[PDB]
Design a protein around this nucleic acid. Structure first.
Ligand SMILES: [Mg+2]
Ligand SMILES: [Mg+2]
Ligand SMILES: [Mg+2]
Ligand SMILES: [Mg+2]
Ligand SMILES: [Mg+2]
Ligand SMILES: [Mg+2]
Ligand SMILES: [Mg+2]
Ligand SMILES: [Mg+2]
Ligand SMILES: [Mg+2]
Ligand SMILES: [Mg+2]
Ligand SMILES: [Mg+2]
Ligand SMILES: [Mg+2]
Ligand SMILES: [Mg+2]
Ligand SMILES: [Mg+2]
Ligand SMILES: [Mg+2]
Ligand SMILES: [Mg+2]
Ligand SMILES: [Mg+2]
Ligand SMILES: [Mg+2]
Ligand SMILES: [Mg+2]
Ligand SMILES: [Mg+2]
Ligand SMILES: [Mg+2]
Ligand SMILES: [Mg+2]
Ligand SMILES: [Mg+2]
Ligand SMILES: [Mg+2]
Ligand SMILES: [Mg+2]
Ligand SMILES: [Mg+2]
Ligand SMILES: [Mg+2]
Ligand SMILES: [Mg+2]
Ligand SMILES: [Mg+2]
Ligand SMILES: [Mg+2]
Ligand SMILES: [Mg+2]
Ligand SMILES: [Mg+2]
Ligand SMILES: [Mg+2]
Ligand SMILES: [Mg+2]
Ligand SMILES: [Mg+2]
Ligand SMILES: [Mg+2]
Ligand SMILES: [Mg+2]
Lengths: 184, 258, 185
RNA sequence: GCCCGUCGCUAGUACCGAUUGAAUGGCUUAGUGAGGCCUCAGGAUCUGCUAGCGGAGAAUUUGGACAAACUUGGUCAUUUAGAGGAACUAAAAGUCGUAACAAGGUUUCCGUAGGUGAACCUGCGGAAGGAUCAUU
RNA sequence: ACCCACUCGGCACCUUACGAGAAAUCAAAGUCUUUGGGUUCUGGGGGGAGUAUGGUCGCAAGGCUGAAACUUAAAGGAAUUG
RNA sequence: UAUCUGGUUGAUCCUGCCAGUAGUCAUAUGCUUGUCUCAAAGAUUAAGCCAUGCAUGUCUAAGUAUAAGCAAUACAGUGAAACUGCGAAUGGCUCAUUAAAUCAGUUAUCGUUUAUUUGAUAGUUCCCUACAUGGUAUAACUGUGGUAAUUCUAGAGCUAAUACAUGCUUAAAAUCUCAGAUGUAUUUAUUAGAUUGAUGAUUCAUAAUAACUUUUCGAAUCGCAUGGCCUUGUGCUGGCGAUGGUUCAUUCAAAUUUCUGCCCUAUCAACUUUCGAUGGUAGGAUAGUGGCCUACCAUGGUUUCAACGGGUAACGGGGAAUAAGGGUUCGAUUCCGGAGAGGGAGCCUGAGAAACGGCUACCACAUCCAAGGAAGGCAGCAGGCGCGCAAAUUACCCAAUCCUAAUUCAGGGAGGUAGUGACAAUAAAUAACGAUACAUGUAAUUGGAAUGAGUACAAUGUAAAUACCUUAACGAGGAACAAUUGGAGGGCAAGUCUGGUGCCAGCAGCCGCGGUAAUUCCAGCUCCAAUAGCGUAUAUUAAAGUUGUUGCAGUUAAAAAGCUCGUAGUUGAACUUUGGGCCCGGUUGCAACGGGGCCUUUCUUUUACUUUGAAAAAAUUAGAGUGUUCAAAGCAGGCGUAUUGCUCGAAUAUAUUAGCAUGGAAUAAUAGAAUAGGACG
RNA sequence: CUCUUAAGGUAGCCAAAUGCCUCGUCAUCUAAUUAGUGACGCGCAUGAAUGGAUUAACGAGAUUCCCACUGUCCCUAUCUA
RNA sequence: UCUAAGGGUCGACGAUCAACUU
């Protein structure tokens, strides 16, 4: 099968290496997951040492964290809008680590309302304790009016079966917004 | 080569077993256990070559399967159990307790001890680590993990292990001027006092040892085992006390028997 | 497989095959000591060359160097025990100045003769070959034995070997059984 | 005395050589491509909870990557056939002359060029290893 | 210009060799078995053979590089007496 | 353990090779072969092809027993079969591939997986069973069969689990959220992890917060004893264990990995880079790092200090032969590492295989067949064919060495034992002693002893033997119980001997000998050499200072480039703290030699070198000890007795390349302050 | 060794678009070859600016073989204007 | 059906405009 060995992959002088040691199972690679969106389908791969990997195909929900109020709500991934390694992954909506996706934002709005009570996107004085210092940003809340939050995948769906991630914030969000308003 | 080897060819066994060359093709491969493959001494070797109690491996396993032998308080019916340094081999039939210690030539000397001191054993603290739930623990030279260790027990210290409750009764701290056994290298089996420790960040720690006769030899920290202070070893030393006489004075001691 | 069996040669042939003076010296030694072939002289000269090599290696070392002291003392002890090196030549230079006859003298085929147990060296050879000589409480049937200078006081006949004890022999019995008839009855 | 080469006979060893020669093996473009593996499906029949609905699921099946192998072509290597050509060596007291060794009967030799049955000859420059260490 | 003396550098020469060498001879071919100042190139018995082949340079002639099979007990150097 | 000799000439001195000579665990072959110990052995050529038989199975008390299997009030014991578990990835073989690859020494994992062993570790589980859940489950077994054939299986009826799938009981303590959540495991994000643990160093160990999971674990298991208290019942409790299980550590491992080191070749000088070559970002994949793969981007990476290519009748090393010193050559092969199982490739299971005495496919072979089909892989052990100059028995056994399993028991062609065997190695029979004659020796002149070569009661040995050791009886007289293999011109020890042949036959490594005078051929006799061995062939080592670093030669013997420049390489003038004095203290014999410390203007550049130390497996080598009868060997053994046992050992040295630590500071290189951007507090 | 010429065809080349004999001989090419090619050469009657030999490239030039391709053929049939 | 690269004018970017070739 696929081999991660360096006995192929000719040496740094450019010399072609002679073959020894027919392919070893401890050097095997496998097929990419190419995780898509929707109708969760996870396959268990038996890995070295009896361990198990989870190939995510067609994942629908991911656990995304705001990282500014530390909520980590479970939400639905809408689609892939940017991927730094391959635009084809954006085209095909292939879920993958470091992919820039859009998430539902509804659990985050519901938590913001149950926490601050400050009408984000449209036991009494806990809203008072979480005081007027609640302005999040001028780019993370303007997305709530559309109900789509830009997020970045952080887990590896092909490895862990999960599609967790974090909401874009600050200079990371500015960078990806520049990229999106260029390539869109 | 497709898996773990299960055979140990003769001439590949550790030399300090004093194994016969033309006995057979194979040696007793030390099973996985507390100490190591090379630094170990199988119960078959210690029962058939160091005490001559048994004559064959069959007879070694015959002795073992009736619960006669006992390594560190437990039965250890394994024919090739890897007993090693500071281990207590007690047999109740022929009631006597041995402590596996190194003679000055570097072999596992037969060292009879009394029950009142075979109750315990010594252990060199291999590592100090916080376990799950934030519980500190120490790992010793024999592969023992002991929870809730004294907060002053660091690496390379020695701990006295109850060997019935498996807890730390006392601990000697690695410092200049304590009695140390050498458990590896050229000076394997020597006893002396720490004089100085050279640090060598990144590399290997070196320690200079001065035996009773003021001989000063340096060796790697990996194989020095604190066993107490000078003149007060926390254990009983074998017949030679790790002096390392030269061949000339050894021949002299030998010819002093006429 | 089992560990190999170490083995070494014990002799060395001369480089020149047909040196007449060396041939005559070897034949002189073989006639004096009752030797079967030149290979025995070869073996003794090989032992002497090994001894000389070790002694030279030690003598090139510094004096009171521990290795020289220990190994030269051991070599001299072994040689004086075997009786090749005399009692007053314990210096590691007389080891160099040894000879072939100094080793051929301690042969049991030579000691048996010099002790009067045999009429000649060939008598001694056949007497050792025929199990007639015992060194201690042990029959020794090997001519080359290198008496340890303590066995010299003990080289006598065996309780077997009907020259020093119980039995009368083998051909004596048949000659008696035929002399019974030769008597007439 | 010693000696050189052509030519002629015999034997051996290599070389060139039409044959787009032959065979074997390695690598390889392209084409086809088994098989398992991952994946899109598929649903025999096998029982369960109530025609509603799930679970296990064989054949088959889509697309991938890994790819044996074969065909064709290319290339490399190593053996090998070959009319004929041209050498070398050995043997042979064959033929022709006598080139060298004496100033070897034209001193020899080097480089180069041309010529001639063959050694060789001749021109030009060089050397003495010359047959001259020598003309105040 | 010449003479005399000295000097540095050069082409050489004469005598003697401590010394070197197989010798012829050599002030270097000496300071080498008492073997090491630095460094480049070349040779390894005589032929086959500076041949064949490949490469490269050349207009060509050829140059540079350069084998093998096979064969052989000498070939060769200096000197001595005829 | 530092050696030469024959051959060029009429003679000489050289060069120089040829020839001789010696060794080879170095192979073949010829002749010969009595004894004991040891034991290599189908590597070379064909990693060629293989008939046949065996080489991997495994059970305790402790997973499952209604064998219609045995035997003396549910089985109480044993126990075929089978399911389950574990193993079959070790071993053993071979050297085909393989030249920075393997491998060696040395590193790293703060870059990962790890069955097992060992140690530690789990009060938190529920959205009408726990005094114990199901078949949704089946085997073995019973009965019906197909095929010629396979370790082929269909159909029907049961039946369990430590197989499979589910699923509760443990309060108390315990804080946060607005009654619930709070064990662990997975995934993500954030926080602490200080100066409140560790490291040289971390985004480490670890903890916390918020969540997340096609649910992970949190025993529905088994044996032997049954004990204590008691509401005396189906009470409550309580042992020693086995197996299992999460995580961590440990061990056995694995995989990658640092540095340095491989033979010949330039008639290989450029190579790699579209098609990954070197790097960057991101991702995928992996156990994990990593161009390992992908996407985008950059244009890099190696090289005369030899890249790349070609060859190897190349697996690497430990080591072996030879060896004054230096070296040369070899290493398929007893140990370590690697790779392969006809050639490739792919993959299942499993902790671990890209496994081949596992599977799948193709290629080449090739078995059987009832022609439909089915089954293969000796470079395991024997054995056959083929190839060749070239290599053993289709033997016995688990007793030893160890290995494997559920395991004290079973299994093991692993291994051991024997058979063949002049591979090589050790020891060393073929005679010894008298008398008589003759001049210490000569003669088929004679006598008494000695013994094993054999043979063989027993007994030891052995797993059972064989043999060895030990021995009853036998078994020496041309002791026929008969030693050979090569030679006698020189080298080179030994014949102008006799007969034969006559430039023939032949010998002769070389020089030569043979042509009617042969010391050289064929023989006889005699003699020489080595000897149960000796010769021959090839290879290699010494000889060879004829490969030269030590250590060659180059005017004429072979060899100085036609000449100069010139890059790499090699090499490169001198100079910087010397010299006084005072001490302490070593080792050897007041002396000698070696230090360390103070004064005398004086108390952290970069390298090489060198000292010391650790390292450099064992075996091997050198070597200490040790009467294996000596010896090769082996690591044994020794010392006393009527014990109811005491004791010494299995040292030491060396691998001097690379890395590591340390002392020195000569030698050799390197850097300092010059437009001062210098030093000092 | 002869006769003989002004000189006696040199270097090359050849059964050649130049060779009668001749379909020369040998080899190769094919199942078979008066063809083609490579050799040989006492060459009826080759040959040196009446230019000799060779030549990369070029050619609606002459020729042989091979692959592809086909109704040229085996063996003809059919359709359209 | 898309992706990327290759421009003009004006005031490290912004505004505007434009054609095809790969
Ligand atoms: Mg002449
Ligand atoms: Mg002349
Ligand atoms: Mg003339
Ligand atoms: Mg030559
Ligand atoms: Mg001459
Ligand atoms: Mg020779
Ligand atoms: Mg073979
Ligand atoms: Mg193996
Ligand atoms: Mg961490
Ligand atoms: Mg990456
Ligand atoms: Mg090799
Ligand atoms: Mg090979
Ligand atoms: Mg090897
Ligand atoms: Mg081979
Ligand atoms: Mg091996
Ligand atoms: Mg394999
Ligand atoms: Mg085979
Ligand atoms: Mg395989
Ligand atoms: Mg097999
Ligand atoms: Mg196998
Ligand atoms: Mg076999
Ligand atoms: Mg005989
Ligand atoms: Mg006998
Ligand atoms: Mg004769
Ligand atoms: Mg002679
Ligand atoms: Mg020479
Ligand atoms: Mg000359
Ligand atoms: Mg010359
Ligand atoms: Mg230069
Ligand atoms: Mg200098
Ligand atoms: Mg002509
Ligand atoms: Mg013609
Ligand atoms: Mg023609
Ligand atoms: Mg035709
Ligand atoms: Mg003309
Ligand atoms: Mg004309
Ligand atoms: Mg035209």
């Amino acid at each position: 099968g696929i081999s991660r060995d360096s006995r192929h992959k000719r040496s740094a002088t450019g010399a072609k290496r002679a073959q020894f040691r027919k392919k070893r199972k401890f050097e095997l690679g496998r097929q990419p997951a190419n995780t898509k969106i929707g109708a969760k389908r996870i396959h268990s791969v038996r890995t070295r040492g009896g361990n198990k990997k989870y190939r995510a195909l067609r994942i629908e929900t991911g656990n995304f964290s705001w990282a500014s109020e530390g909520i980590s709500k479970k939400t639905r991934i809408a689609g892939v809008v940017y991927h730094p390694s391959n635009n084809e992954l954006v085209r095909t909506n292939t879920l993958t680590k470091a992919a820039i996706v859009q998430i539902d934002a509804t659990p985050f709005r519901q938590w913001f309302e149950a926490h601050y009570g400050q009408t984000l996107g449209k036991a009494e004085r806990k809203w008072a304790a979480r005081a007027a210092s609640a302005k999040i940003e001028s780019s993370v809340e303007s997305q709530f009016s559309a109900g789509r939050l830009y997020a970045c995948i952080s887990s590896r769906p092909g490895q862990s079966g999960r599609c967790d991630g974090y909401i874009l914030e600050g200079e990371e969000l500015a960078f990806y917004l520049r990229r999106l308003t260029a390539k869109k | 080569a497709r898996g773990p080897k299960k055979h140990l060819k003769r001439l590949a066994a550790p030399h300090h077993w004093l194994l016969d060359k033309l006995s057979g093709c194979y040696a007793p491969r030390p099973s996985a256990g507390p100490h190591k493959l090379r630094e170990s001494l199988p119960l078959i070797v210690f029962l058939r070559n160091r005490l001559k109690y048994a004559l064959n491996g069959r007879e070694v396993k015959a002795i073992l399967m009736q619960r006669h032998v006992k390594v560190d308080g437990k039965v250890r019916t394994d024919t090739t159990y890897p007993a090693g340094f500071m281990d207590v081999i007690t047999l109740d039939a022929t009631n006597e307790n041995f402590r596996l210690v190194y003679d000055v030539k570097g072999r596992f000397a037969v060292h009879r001890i009394t029950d009142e001191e075979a109750s315990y054993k010594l252990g060199k603290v291999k590592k100090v680590q916080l376990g799950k739930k934030g519980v500190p623990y120490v790992v010793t030279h024999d592969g023992r993990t002991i929870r809730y260790p004294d907060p002053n027990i660091k690496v390379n210290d020695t701990v006295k292990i109850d060997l019935a409750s498996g807890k730390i009764t006392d601990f000697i701290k690695f410092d200049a001027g304590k009695l140390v056994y050498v458990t590896g290298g050229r000076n394997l089996g020597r006893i002396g006092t720490i004089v100085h420790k050279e640090r060598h960040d990144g590399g290997f720690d070196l320690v200079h040892i001065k035996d009773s006769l003021d001989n000063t030899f340096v060796t790697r920290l990996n194989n020095v085992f604190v066993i107490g202070e000078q003149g007060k070893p926390y254990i009983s030393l074998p017949k030679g006390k790790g002096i390392k006489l030269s061949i000339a004075e050894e021949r002299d001691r030998r010819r002093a028997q006429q | 497989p089992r560990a190999p069996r170490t083995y070494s040669k014990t002799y060395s042939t001369p480089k020149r095959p047909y040196e007449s003076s060396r041939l005559d010296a070897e034949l002189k030694l073989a006639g004096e000591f009752g030797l079967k072939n030149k290979k025995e002289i070869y073996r003794i000269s090989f032992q002497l060359s090994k001894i000389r090599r070790a002694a030279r290696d030690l003598l090139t070392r510094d004096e009171k160097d521990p290795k020289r002291l220990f190994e030269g003392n051991a070599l001299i002890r072994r040689l004086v025990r075997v009786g090749v090196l005399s009692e007053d030549k314990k210096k590691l230079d007389y080891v160099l100045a040894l000879k072939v006859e100094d080793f051929l003298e301690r042969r049991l085929q030579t000691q048996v003769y010099k002790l009067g147990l045999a009429k000649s060296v060939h008598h001694a050879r056949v007497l050792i070959t025929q199990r007639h000589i015992a060194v201690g409480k042990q029959i020794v049937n090997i001519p080359s034995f290198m008496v340890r200078l303590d066995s010299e006081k003990h080289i006598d006949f065996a309780p077997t070997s009907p020259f020093g004890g119980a039995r009368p022999g083998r051909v004596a019995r048949r000659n008696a059984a035929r002399k019974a008839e030769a008597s007439g009855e």
